[PDB]
Design a protein around this ligand. Structure first.
Ligand SMILES: [Mn+2]
Length: 150
RNA sequence: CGCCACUUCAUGGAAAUAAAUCACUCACGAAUGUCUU
């Protein structure tokens, strides 16, 4: 809880310093509206800064668990990111749906899990193939050219 | 000293060889994000 609160405060500070707007940052959830590029920094620079802040807070407040999971060879807490860049006149509801789709379905690999679970073949060996720590990014131009990657 | 002409009329080698084979720029821009009953 201490690590999450510290990360939330530092993420608010970083979003304000970059030049964006914090919508909601609480627990493990973050929602921000930021410029594509301003004062030389990009969106991906902000994402890297947020990931660094999360890692720093995890190290600072969870050092015992980090040390235990280091030699035990177990994954550490991580942040999955979903970035959508759209024209300012593009509907905000569609942009938010695109961001949710990116984050959940691609960045959290919920497409694999959802397709497996709808057919009831999730099992455990298949659950071994759930991939986290992903960045989903999509840029839709004014002509709908949409560049997307993960 | 005199007298006197014939013969021969292109073969062999090289017959193309390397370098560059597209380069840069633009890869959508503006309007409309609902309107009238
Ligand atoms: Mn959450």
């Amino acid at each position: 809880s201490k690590a999450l609160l510290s990360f939330n405060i530092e993420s608010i500070n970083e979003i304000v310093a970059y030049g964006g707007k914090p919508i909601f940052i609480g627990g493990d959830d973050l929602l921000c509206f930021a410029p594509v590029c301003c004062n030389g920094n990009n969106v991906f620079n902000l994402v890297e800064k947020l990931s660094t802040c999360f890692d720093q807070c995890i190290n600072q407040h969870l050092q015992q668990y980090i040390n235990a999971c280091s030699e035990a060879q177990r994954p550490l807490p991580s942040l999955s990111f979903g970035i959508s860049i759209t024209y300012h006149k593009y509907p905000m509801f569609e942009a938010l749906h695109t961001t949710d789709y990116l984050l959940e379905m691609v960045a959290k690999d919920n497409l694999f899990k959802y397709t497996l679970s709808n057919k009831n073949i999730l099992n455990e060996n298949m659950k071994r193939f759930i991939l986290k720590n992903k960045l989903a990014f999509s840029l839709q131009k004014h002509s709908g050219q949409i560049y997307h990657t993960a």
